[PDB]
Design a protein around this motif. Structure first.
Motif, PDB file in Angstrom:
ATOM      1  N   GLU A 118       0.872  -1.178   0.000  1.00 39.23           N
ATOM      2  CA  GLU A 118       0.000   0.000   0.000  1.00 39.23           C
ATOM      3  C   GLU A 118       0.909   1.229   0.000  1.00 39.23           C
ATOM      4  OE1 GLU A 118      -3.347   0.020   2.616  1.00 39.23           O
ATOM      5  OE2 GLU A 118      -4.023  -2.009   2.019  1.00 39.23           O
ATOM      6  N   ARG A 119       0.781   2.102  -1.004  1.00 38.32           N
ATOM      7  CA  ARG A 119       1.779   3.135  -1.143  1.00 38.32           C
ATOM      8  C   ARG A 119       1.289   4.278  -2.030  1.00 38.32           C
ATOM      9  NH1 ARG A 119       6.946   1.619  -3.817  1.00 38.32           N
ATOM     10  NH2 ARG A 119       6.875   0.006  -2.146  1.00 38.32           N
ATOM     11  N   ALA A 120       2.068   5.341  -1.995  1.00 35.81           N
ATOM     12  CA  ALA A 120       1.987   6.457  -2.934  1.00 35.81           C
ATOM     13  C   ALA A 120       2.516   6.062  -4.306  1.00 35.81           C
ATOM     14  CB  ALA A 120       2.735   7.623  -2.321  1.00 35.81           C
ATOM     15  N   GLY A 121       2.557   7.040  -5.233  1.00 40.42           N
ATOM     16  CA  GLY A 121       2.830   6.737  -6.627  1.00 40.42           C
ATOM     17  C   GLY A 121       4.320   6.835  -6.969  1.00 40.42           C
ATOM     18  N   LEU A 122       5.117   5.863  -6.502  1.00 42.91           N
ATOM     19  CA  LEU A 122       6.549   5.772  -6.750  1.00 42.91           C
ATOM     20  C   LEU A 122       7.043   4.355  -6.454  1.00 42.91           C
ATOM     21  CD1 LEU A 122       8.453   5.882  -3.942  1.00 42.91           C
ATOM     22  CD2 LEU A 122       7.444   8.176  -3.899  1.00 42.91           C
TER      23      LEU A 122
END
Ligand SMILES: Cc1ncc(COP(=O)(O)O)c(/C=N/C(C(=O)O)C(=O)O)c1O
Ligand SMILES: Cc1ncc(COP(=O)(O)O)c(/C=N/C(C(=O)O)C(=O)O)c1O
Lengths: 406, 406
Positions: free
Chosen positions: A328-332
């Motif tokens: 689960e993460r940001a866009g990178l």
């Protein structure tokens, strides 16, 4: 629903070739590109109403002032601050955090006091505290990370004590893509008598920020990461904290009365804005906000969730590649190829028109925690596409083959 | 020889009306207007090669880096510094002076030490020193002014002692138009064991600067006053002084190694540039320099000498008006109408399209020295004309008549 073609059309820089290939810009965590709405805002300022700020002197002066203060209100609304008194224009996230370290930490730390940070912090949210604790004889402590590069609230509760005066932590990691549980960390800090300082440089461009809901005491962001001009940022602080803090810099505009030896300060926010301000940049940041709001931050966040999920899946399709951090993460995506130095990955990708970054990403303690000396990173924003991620993974495959043969 | 028509043609902002009259912008000491060469530089940056700085990663990154560092060299050449290590990009003159006050003065002042300034200083070159002396228990002293608002070298020699560690003084006054004898003041400071800090915000736009000839230890300037973007400035310092100074701000880009508790700094100039820099602004400042160099600073200075001489003569033609400061001066006139508050002068002039400034001009101690609480100021640059000065003096005459009747 967000049309990526119509969005990309507004960014002139995207429409060019590098080394005979269409540009594939995947380095928005280093800096973001700008739409015509923002560039044309700067143009209109310098073509039509540039003047120094202060109403009621002359017509262009009033227009410039209204633009500058107008942009401050835009920012207030955008992060849901209560008051424009809590919105300070700075040169960027780094300066914002330094102001807290200088004017807040150096005045509220003594031997025995702790400043608590994390292993995943950017340098901007490490070095000011290292310096503040050395100046005051306080102690710096680190919250440990879990194996997937997230922070457990149990470890926060363990590290933070009744001697903690400041917790400083990133909203989103510029390397792991972790979204930290800031709202819950704020409650733990407050329960211990501490303030919380949030490094929002990587969150603000990419997801809605509500400082009242987060209950952060301070929050720092950069224009250049969120479609806005270079050289400008924001420091948000709770008004009651800012009131009691002394200025970090001194001069014109932030004074009320100046005698030979002593001076008094203006009210907030101007107390913290010394000299001629960043007029054009601030106005252009307001235009970036307008642009982002029109698209919708939730829409942008959903687009990036899709890109991130797609990238992680496609990276798992490659042998001999390691990705760091959680699902689960940001866009990178930060990664390494098994047998290839990431600087050489970046070089070879750039010959295919693909812009990524290699190095430590201003997080040398995190690299040590990861047991690496450097990494490569592909980072995304509202103008990027799945086709671009296809190009990246195809190029990484070719990179592996190429260094295998050699 | 400088053609004023062809120069004015390059500044789009000049070609508009305010309250039905052609704009007459006479407030360049507050901020200057920009030519298309500078605006289009910003445009080309954001349209074509914006990226964060650091060579050898990707193509746009290298182009941005070369632009930024290229601009640093432009600045070096422009003020005749020896080295790019001595050229630090800041947010403006105010920040530059604060950096000296923080990193130099606070480390080299003890009880008994003196900081010497002058009554004509801008707040930017007062308040940082007030704060530095309070922090260290040193003493602040003022050089007295002569009756025409100049400084005699005899008074400098009198005020500066073997206890003086810092002399800080303006190159040019933003109120009196006085050009101070900086080169001779530097010799007096050095003879006493002091460094000299020069506030060059008002000189740099308008006349050639040669830091080797001046032998100043530090020199501060602002982009926004010299046809360049807002939000950027320069701190020049002699390399041997900068080497021994600690950073004023901490973060990414200014570090070499970062451990958990301790860090080492990069070499100059980057030691003093924390975080993502002011990329576009710096590049646009380099374009402002290119533009100014093409016209010629000597040519600009000659134009302003003519404007100033013409203005002083025409002001002497008006009854009931006082001009402050000397005959030999930079291109500005600060004045009052006998029976009219300067704020009302500014308001009425703006209804005739004429932009001047009223107030204290960030020099409250000078206003006290002048025995006034406020003044009006008309200030000139390379795009202004004698016809504009005619309009100003005609409007001042009408202003007097108007407030006489009322
Ligand atoms: C989480 C986080 N914290 C602080 C910063 C520094 O913001 P800046 O002062 O605008 O350089 C940044 C910007 N990092 C960039 C940069 O260093 O180029 C990056 O990740 O490449 C960041 O992402
Ligand atoms: C001699 C001199 N010293 C310092 C400054 C402050 O430079 P800034 O940091 O760019 O506001 C200035 C800029 N003064 C302006 C301003 O305060 O708007 C003016 O004179 O109106 C100055 O002229």
């Amino acid at each position: 629903h967000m049309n990526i073609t119509d969005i990309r059309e507004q960014f002139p820089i995207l429409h060019q070739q590098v080394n005979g290939h269409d540009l594939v810009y995947l380095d928005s965590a280093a800096t973001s590109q700008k739409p015509r709405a923002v560039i044309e805002t700067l143009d209109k300022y310098y073509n039509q109403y540039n003047s120094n700020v202060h109403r009621g002197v002359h017509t262009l002066g009033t227009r410039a002032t209204d633009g500058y203060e107008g942009a401050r209100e835009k920012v207030r609304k955008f992060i849901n601050a209560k008051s424009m008194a809590e919105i300070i224009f700075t040169k960027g996230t780094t300066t914002s955090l330094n102001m807290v370290a200088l004017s807040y930490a150096r005045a509220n730390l003594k031997p025995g006091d702790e400043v608590v940070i994390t292993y995943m912090e950017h340098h901007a949210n490490i070095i000011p505290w290292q310096q503040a604790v050395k100046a005051t004889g306080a102690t710096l402590k680190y919250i440990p990370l879990q194996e997937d590069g997230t922070i457990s609230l149990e470890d926060v509760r363990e590290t933070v004590t009744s001697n903690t005066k400041i917790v400083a932590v990133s909203h989103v990691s510029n390397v792991l893509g972790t979204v930290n549980p800031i709202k819950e960390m704020a409650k733990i800090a407050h329960d211990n008598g501490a303030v919380i300082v949030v490094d929002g440089a990587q969150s603000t461009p990419h997801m809605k920020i509500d400082v009242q809901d987060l209950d952060c005491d301070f929050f720092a962001l950069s224009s250049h990461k969120m479609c806005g001009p270079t050289g400008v940022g924001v420091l948000y602080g709770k008004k009651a904290l800012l009131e009691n803090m002394e200025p970090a810099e001194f001069g014109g505009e932030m004074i009320d009365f100046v005698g030979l030896y002593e001076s008094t300060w203006k009210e907030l926010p101007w107390k913290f804005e010394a000299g001629t301000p960043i007029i054009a940049g601030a106005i252009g940041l307001g235009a970036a906000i307008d642009f982002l709001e029109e698209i919708g931050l939730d829409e942008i966040s959903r687009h990036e969730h899709k890109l991130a999920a797609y990238a992680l899946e496609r990276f798992r399709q490659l042998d001999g590649v390691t990705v760091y951090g959680p699902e689960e993460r940001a866009g990178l995506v930060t990664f390494n190829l098994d047998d290839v130095h990431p600087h050489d990955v970046a070089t070879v990708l750039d010959a295919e028109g693909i812009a990524v970054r290699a190095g430590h990403h201003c997080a040398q303690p995190l690299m040590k925690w990861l047991d690496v000396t450097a990494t490569a990173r592909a980072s995304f924003y509202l103008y990027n596409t799945e086709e671009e991620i296809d190009k990246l993974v195809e190029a990484l495959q070719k990179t592996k083959e190429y260094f295998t043969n050699v």
